[PDB]
């Protein structure tokens, strides 16, 4: 029905500004609904900061005490947000969310997009391919992955075989340190699928514009 | 401000079973109009919240209708007439009423299950990332229930805990289940100055902890 997809900078120097952009499909923003932002911090804690409705008419959190800006264009059907003087404490998701205005109803969000505010450099990462070793490799299932290390800002995706391998895959949550993050995924196939059926790790880093296509090969001959 | 606070902080649960939660505001909700703008979300995993309840007692669009809203005044309830795996996730409730709206501090339902042992499995650092002078010696233990877990790194016998980092998933809607990561970080000359390296997971499916090995230059 209605859908809501966000844009905009993922990383942003402390006292500039963050910028986002809502992009609404399936109804016209100047019907029926408010248009809101609302945050998420890294404790899981959600804050409503404001919206825009469909006439025009704003409303914002008094805890973003003149920082915030909420505007739309509706020739091109979107609606959008700007925070201003920000901090590492403003580093969270950020969703777009459609309310009816009526009565609360139909709450439709976008995916979310992260922001990081932070004076670190964007780093490229490295991606390291988890090849089994070859004593756990007799079973019936074996267990294959990829390290990605050293990049910056989050987030980085991962998908196995181009996204056709989705079943048996573990990808865990980046740790941060120094800057750098580190991220892990696993999959586990039919140990006699392998090597016969080639694995490989998709990495992508939108805000370095990187992609690896990692083929595991296994320790041993190949 | 409004006030919304949710309880229990969280609920274990067996598939089939029922499941309430609560959320009290410290004003009242009703509006001038007879409505109650209070809505109900649940979040899963990785996704963004989405709708469940709205108008206190109402089941939002395309919402199946095993959730039930009820309440009113300051006092309202969630049930979960029978509880599936793909419901896991952080509940929350928020409230229009009251400027600025408000939302509660989420209760996580997790998903009651028979125990299992971790698959433990653990990987030499790649050729590529040698010739960069790091080093990293990869542990993962996949598809354990409960999520308490305890992961040690042994090199040549010894236990090591400098270098350590460790990564868990949320609970797997697939199956129930828990995994982790753990990473141990050192020099590529460390690495080469030393020959076994073992992960050793302690969970309570067993009173013998999983222990993996592998010997540097050896495949």
């Known amino acids: 029905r209605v859908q809501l997809q966000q844009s905009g900078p993922g990383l942003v120097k402390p006292s500039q500004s963050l910028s986002l952009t809502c992009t609404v499909t399936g109804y016209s923003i100047t019907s029926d609904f408010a248009w809101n932002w609302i945050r998420q911090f890294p404790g899981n804690k959600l804050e409503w900061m404001g919206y825009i409705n469909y006439s025009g008419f704003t409303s914002h959190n008094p805890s973003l005490k003149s920082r915030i800006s909420i505007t739309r264009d509706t020739s091109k059907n979107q609606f959008f947000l700007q925070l201003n003087s920000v901090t590492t404490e403003d580093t969270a998701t950020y969703y777009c969310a459609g309310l009816l205005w009526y009565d609360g109803g139909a709450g439709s969000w976008g995916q979310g997009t992260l922001v990081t505010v932070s004076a670190a450099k964007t780093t490229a990462p490295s991606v390291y391919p988890l090849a089994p070793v070859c004593g756990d490799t007799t079973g019936s299932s074996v267990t294959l992955g990829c390290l990605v290390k050293g990049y910056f800002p989050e987030p980085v995706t991962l998908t196995w075989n181009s996204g056709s391998l989705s079943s048996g895959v573990h990808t865990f949550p980046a740790v941060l340190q120094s800057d750098l993050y580190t991220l892990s995924s696993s999959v586990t196939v039919t140990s006699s699928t392998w090597p016969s059926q080639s694995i490989t790790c998709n990495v992508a880093h939108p805000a370095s514009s990187t992609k690896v296509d990692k083929k595991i090969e296994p320790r041993g001959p190949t | ?219």
């Open chain 2, 1 to 219: 401000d409004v006030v919304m606070t949710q309880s229990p902080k969280t609920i274990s649960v067996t598939i089939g079973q029922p499941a309430s939660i609560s959320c009290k505001s410290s004003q009242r909700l009703l509006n001038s109009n007879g409505k109650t703008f209070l809505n109900w979300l649940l979040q899963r995993p990785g996704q963004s919240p989405k709708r469940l309840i709205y108008l206190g007692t109402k089941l939002d669009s395309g919402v199946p209708d095993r959730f039930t809203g009820s309440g009113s005044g300051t006092d309202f309830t969630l049930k979960i007439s029978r509880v599936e795996a793909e419901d896991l996730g952080v509940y929350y409730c928020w409230q229009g009423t009251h400027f600025p709206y408000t939302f509660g501090g989420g209760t996580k339902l997790e998903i009651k299950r028979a125990d299992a042992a971790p698959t433990v499995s653990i990987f030499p650092p790649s050729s590529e990332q040698l010739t960069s002078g790091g080093a990293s010696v990869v542990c993962f233990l996949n598809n354990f229930y409960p999520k308490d877990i305890n992961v040690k790194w042994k090199i040549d016998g010894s236990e090591r805990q400098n270098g350590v980092l460790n990564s868990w998933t949320d609970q797997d809607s697939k199956d129930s289940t828990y995994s982790m990561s753990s990473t141990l970080t050192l020099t590529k000359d460390e690495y080469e100055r030393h020959n076994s390296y073992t992960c050793e997971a302690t969970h309570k499916t067993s009173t013998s902890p999983i222990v993996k090995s592998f010997n540097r230059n050896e495949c």
